From a paper:
The major enzymatic function of XPD is to unwind the DNA double helix around lesions such as photoproducts to allow repair. In eukaryotes, XPD is one of the components of transcription factor IIH (TFIIH) along with nine other protein subunits. The mechanism of XPD helicase activity remains unclear with uncertainties about the binding of the 3′-end of the translocated DNA strand, the positioning of the junction between single- and double-stranded DNA and the role of protein conformational change in unwinding the DNA.
Here, we present a new TaXPD–DNA complex, obtained by covalently linking the 5′-end of the DNA to the protein through an alkanethiol moiety. Based on the available structure of a TaXPD–DNA complex, we inserted a E542C mutation in the new ‘no cysteine’ native protein to form an intermolecular disulphide between TaXPD and alkanethiol-modified oligonucleotide DNA. The highest quality structure was obtained from a crystal of the TaXPD–13mer covalent complex diffracting to 2.2 Å resolution. Unambiguous unbiased electron density was observed for the 4 nt (TACG) from the 5′- end of the DNA after refinement of the protein. Additionally, some density for the—(CH)6—linker and weak density of the fifth nucleotide (adenosine) that cannot be clearly interpreted appeared after refinement of the first four nucleotides. The nucleotide (G) corresponding to the fifth unresolved position in the previous complex structure is stabilized by the side chain of R529 stacking against the guanine base that also forms hydrogen bonds with E354. The covalent TaXPD–DNA complex agrees with the previous reported TaXPD–DNA structure, in that it shows the strand bound to the HD2 domain.
Numbering used by the authors: 20 to 615
The structure:
Amino acid sequence: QKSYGVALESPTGSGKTIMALKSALQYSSERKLKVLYLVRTNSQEEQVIKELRSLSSTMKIRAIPMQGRVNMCILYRMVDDLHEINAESLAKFCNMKKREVMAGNEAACPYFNFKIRSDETKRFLFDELPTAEEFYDYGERNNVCPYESMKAALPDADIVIAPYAYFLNRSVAEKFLSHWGVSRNQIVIILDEAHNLPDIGRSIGSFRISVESLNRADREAQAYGDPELSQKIHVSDLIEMIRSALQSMVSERCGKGDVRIRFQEFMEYMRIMNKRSEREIRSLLNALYLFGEYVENEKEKVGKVPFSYASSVASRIIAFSDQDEEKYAAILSPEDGGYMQAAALDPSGILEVLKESKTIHMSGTLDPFDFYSDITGFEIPFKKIGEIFPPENRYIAYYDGVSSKYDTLDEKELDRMATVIEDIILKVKKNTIVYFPSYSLMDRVENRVSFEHMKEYRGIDQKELYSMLKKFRRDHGTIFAVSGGRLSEGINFPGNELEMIILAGLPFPRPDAINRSLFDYYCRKYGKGWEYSVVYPTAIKIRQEIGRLIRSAEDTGAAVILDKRAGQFRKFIPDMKKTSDPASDIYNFFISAQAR
DNA sequence: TACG
Ligand code: SF4
Ligand code: NA
Ligand code: NA
């Protein structure tokens, strides 16, 4: 009634968060509106679903998970080994399988059967409220399609939990809404961990063309006849023109990592190297897309997933050649084998469709809200609901004797940082996560310390990570973690499982091509490149990490930032003190906390 | 105008 949404800041899994949710479900039910809960990770899906299970004992909870065939089709990964995939190709795949089962070939998909609609399947979904992953597993266990089972339950569900990537895919969203029986103005969308929304928008809005993707198209060309596209140019010949253009661009234009270019430079290289006009190259690119259509048709008629690398490559290159420089940066990279990318700078375009529904923007760290509102384009009321935790139970401080600042980071600054970290841990003797801006800084600091610790290392798998986490809760001590990893957001350590956090430097972003573009974009639009591309994301990282510490009225903890430049984050963390020796001051804080 |  007031606006098209509301932004609520308060810790996750909390009393006032559950309340806001309870208020949203009553408001929704009163106006015959269904509820859509969007989440970005399995971890956050589980937290949200746990919350809803508690509430099912008090109130009417008619809820399911919903994910797309990409995650929920059991068959296609058993039948194909594809490295790229989409909703569209799987719809064509599945429809063909379902035809074959209706015509008497039950083995075509053995997951497509009566159990899709059975009382037992409907009961597990509605009475048990599984995560998507748990329901996937239940599907395997019972030889029943998770996707089609979710789809069949959908019309009777008042509440759906789904990924951002699922709902923000327009064509998938239209079919979902259509099968749910509802328009966009007939729903309330809860945006879990909404501080991710800008990155979510930019991520969904961006696309790229890699050399490996071209290589995959090259092999596809061999396998399906490699026909003439025009006078003496076969499909493979065109892929070589595209691949060599991209390779030459990378060699000639990038040094260390990514570089910004103009979108039309790709077309320029194609034109000069192969001695053709723009029309001729565009005609060839269209011919490649048509060959893609043929590849789809061929795969489809033998029961394969009709996804074509030639099609995907063709449509992405054509899209790249026609992007407008205003909202998008053309990025050229040597990383991951070589690629060219349309990087979305402004996520408000992608997020705009969410205004057609009511949105509730939930997060522990939305402040400073002006920046969030400017970046997402959401002009909505902001409220700091939630517990005022007693300030005496928390100590937040920074120490200015060291810094992770790049151009002053030599071996002596590293020695200094390690010494301070070691002094704190050995004196305080509490359960600690040390957060590093990079694996590089972590490894170099790790090489200068003696104390035992666990480590969240680059490329660690799910089993090793849960094991280390369960070891931390049980055996206690110290974890070395990195800013972009899985301990920075999300995870809850109740009681004295987490008592201290040390930020070994500040996690300022890299001045890469995308970030240097964001700076220029926010300079032009607001005159505040520094604040919006550098200060803001850094502030949120810091607050998210500190937010791990106090999870209760009676919870006790210390956070210390080991960086000179931390004073400039006082505006966002007002209780932060300076300390000239954190070891004693944190030690003394715990003595006083223990005395009560 | 920052440094995975
Ligand atoms: S029924 Fe399910 S498992 Fe079978 S093809 Fe369709 S989506 Fe895949
Ligand atoms: Na089975
Ligand atoms: Na070739």
